Symmetry: D2
């Protein structure tokens, strides 16, 4: 009857024998972490909750997910190249993982933050993406890339917010001080002038949250994913 | 450094000057509605909640949404043929609307169901799609199609469940009984044997839930949407 | 047995109810035309060959083509927004039109250039493209855009080559010479110094080449394609 | 000015680090070879024409092709997993090989068939396609799939037409006579009843036509393509 409109849709699928990354990146989590007054560069609970949602998800698809890695508002799920999940539908993959994740976020909020509840006008909601990785080397480098990303970001943010806190700086000059440095330089700027050793930093913050199937862990890259299969 | 993995993504975008439909349809909502013991054929609270999320979602993007229409676990949001929202990106449209709606559902569950709190192991989560409609007639027809679908379904399901309830039938001979029947025939099964008149069914069940901008109403297809532009 | 590799293909199609443009443009036609000594930026024979090919093509699909417009090495074919040809498929439409065209080119060459035969090492070969246009305006404007292009460029290159030919200019100072000018300014540069009038330039050069179904004509935009339906 | 129409085009490309195949299959080659009265089901000259074309094609892009394999009206060209050609664009790869090839066919037709020239109303034109293969296994299997199809088809069609030709059979009873047979059974039907030995059938008909870079060979699968890289 009016059914012909269904003609217009698109059911496109990810290429066979490719890994699938589904990545989830929270929308405006700058302002979102501002409103609920998160813990500044790093909120132990906010990050842990992310981990919770991620764990529940890889638990949910325990067969198709090799592992996951979370950063800020972001979390990444690796789908084995052989997966038939959702008949390899991009939309279904992305949207469904995202909704499920979002749903676990909202659900589990009460546990991690009895402090400040959700109000309404300001809510979490997340982006989701399907990315095709044809061979193992690429997935490995993808995962690495995220890991880099977290490393750099925590470094910069940490030595930035210490300067404001400890040395009383404004956002402008704390930036100029940090401009053009190295990884090591900032760690010195942390160690002497901010007076804090960066290795003494908690390990979930530096090296990011990596969920294998079930129980989850935090360390660098040694690719023993090579072994897990 | 590793950044070339971003080389693998796809930013594909809805063709310019096309109306957009972002459709949301809950996953495994049969099991969902069974576990929380929804009101079978129709749960007033459930549908209303759905409506709440919708109202908040067209509120959120006021500029780009013409209107929305909800059915069961489904909602359809129309975007204006000229919209730049999220730069016309399929992924972002779909996934973001999905997260948001979902987020809204889990938030407002506390409100609509003090009866049964959420547990965990059963959580609401929804699928999302983008569709591209090159002209007004098709988008119109689309909406029509949805409405038709809700009218037909509601009639079948209603005479089905009143057969089971009132006359104590098993699903099978209720199916074969209902098999190959017609409109007036179902409604006849309804009033005589099931002792209930169909026109007195709440309007929101029969004709579905239509969200215009801000507040929302429930009737058929008469295109007064044609006038609002 | 090995047949699974077939499952790797992609069957993607043009969104329904969109006019379709198929554009053909010959690769390296600068070097090509330079090799075969085409006449300056205007060769009656080459353009007539192109037109003949296109005439053959709209002859071939008389059912799906509204009309077609040639400029240089370019030819654009407008398929009706309703067409089901090749089931609306990109690969088939681009490559098949391209092939067909290329084949007619190479066929009818001996006709249009009995002067010089084809050699081998340099052969005509053409890029083809599929574009979707969701309504009338867009299509009209596309066509416009093309006609525009042919008109403008006919003027610029004409006066350029007269500056080189008649006035003995080198390209560089002919370019700085023509730089910044206007339409009638250029026509004057043509009329006084180079001794030719641009209104008597052949209407096929100026207003571009246009083929409706069957017989073909050259003028501007008066969109009388409006009526044909 | 009208330029916005260009914003409707589509740049979609092949996923990085995938072998590409460009396959070429002439539309309606049944009627073409019927019209030009080709040789039963194997025309030596037709095949070598096809071959010279593909050689010129691999010749043209010597950098990005591992090799090419032709069968009937078909030819397949394997592009290396790392290729940047046409910036990996679907449209350009398909249409360009399509057109070059078509051009080469029509050109070198003179050489291969001095017997009957091309006419007009019946002209060769070819469908072209792109396929992405994420790994060597699959590209190998692709090729295998092809060689398989040609071997199988050559036997079936050969004893088919020998049954028609020599024993005076009509297509129906040849079709049944051949129905459900095995390889060796068919070669029998060939040796006892049609009087011909399928071992002495020309290796270019049986084992297909394989172009490595430059000069080209006909044998089976022994993948020394593994070493050439
Ligand atoms: N305060 C605070 N913010 C966090 C924390 N974890 C993540 N975030 C926020 O999330 C951001 C991560 O980068 P983005 O995802 O690009 O920020 P975004 O603006 O929310 O996301 P987009 O709109 O997609 O660009 C940071 O700027 C933080 O503000 C945290 O533990 N504490
Ligand atoms: N009992 C009850 N069920 C509802 C209500 N609203 C929606 N539903 C359920 O939602 C379903 C709608 O159909 P689908 O969305 O295709 O069901 P689904 O199995 O969850 O979805 P998929 O797994 O993606 O195919 C119905 O079968 C209903 O059971 C309600 O108000 N009451
Ligand atoms: N000499 C001559 N050249 C022509 C004529 N018509 C078209 N051309 C050539 O066609 C070109 C038109 O632009 P393009 O199609 O972009 O040329 P191209 O660089 O060979 O094509 P691409 O590689 O696809 O960009 C001019 O540079 C001319 O060299 C003609 O009548 N005479
Ligand atoms: N007689 C003859 N036919 C050949 C030869 N080589 C290829 N063919 C034709 O090639 C065809 C291969 O299949 P297709 O190309 O799919 O046939 P088609 O109907 O012409 O093409 P499509 O419309 O694309 O399906 C066979 O039907 C043959 O008729 C040959 O050497 N001799
Ligand atoms: Mg973000
Ligand atoms: Mg981020
Ligand atoms: Mg559903
Ligand atoms: Mg449904
Ligand atoms: Mg060109
Ligand atoms: Mg041009
Ligand atoms: Mg064919
Ligand atoms: Mg074939």
């Amino acid at each position: 009857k009016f059914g012909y409109v269904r003609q217009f849709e698109t059911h496109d699928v990810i290429l066979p024998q490719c890994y699938i990354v589904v990545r989830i990146d929270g929308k405006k989590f700058h302002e979102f972490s501002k409103f609920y007054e998160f813990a500044k560069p790093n909120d132990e609970n906010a990050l842990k909750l992310m981990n919770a949602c991620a764990k529940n998800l890889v638990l949910k698809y325990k067969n198709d997910i090799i592992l996951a890695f979370g950063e800020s508002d972001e979390y990444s799920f690796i789908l084995k190249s052989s997966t038939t999940l959702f008949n390899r539908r991009k939309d279904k993959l992305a949207t469904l993982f995202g909704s499920f994740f979002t749903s676990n976020y909202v659900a589990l909020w009460a546990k991690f933050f009895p402090e400040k509840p959700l109000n309404i006008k300001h809510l979490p909601y997340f982006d989701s993406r399907c990315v095709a990785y044809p061979n193992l080397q690429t997935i490995k480098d993808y995962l690495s890339w995220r890991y880099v990303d977290t490393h750099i970001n925590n470094l910069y943010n940490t030595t930035f917010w210490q300067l404001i806190i400890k040395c009383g700086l404004t956002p402008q000059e704390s930036e100029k001080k940090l401009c053009g440095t190295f990884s090591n330089e900032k760690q010195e700027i942390l160690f002497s002038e901010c007076g804090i050793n960066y290795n003494n930093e908690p390990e979930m913050f530096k090296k990011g949250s990596l969920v294998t199937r079930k129980g989850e862990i935090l360390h660098i890259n040694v690719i023993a994913q090579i072994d897990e299969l």
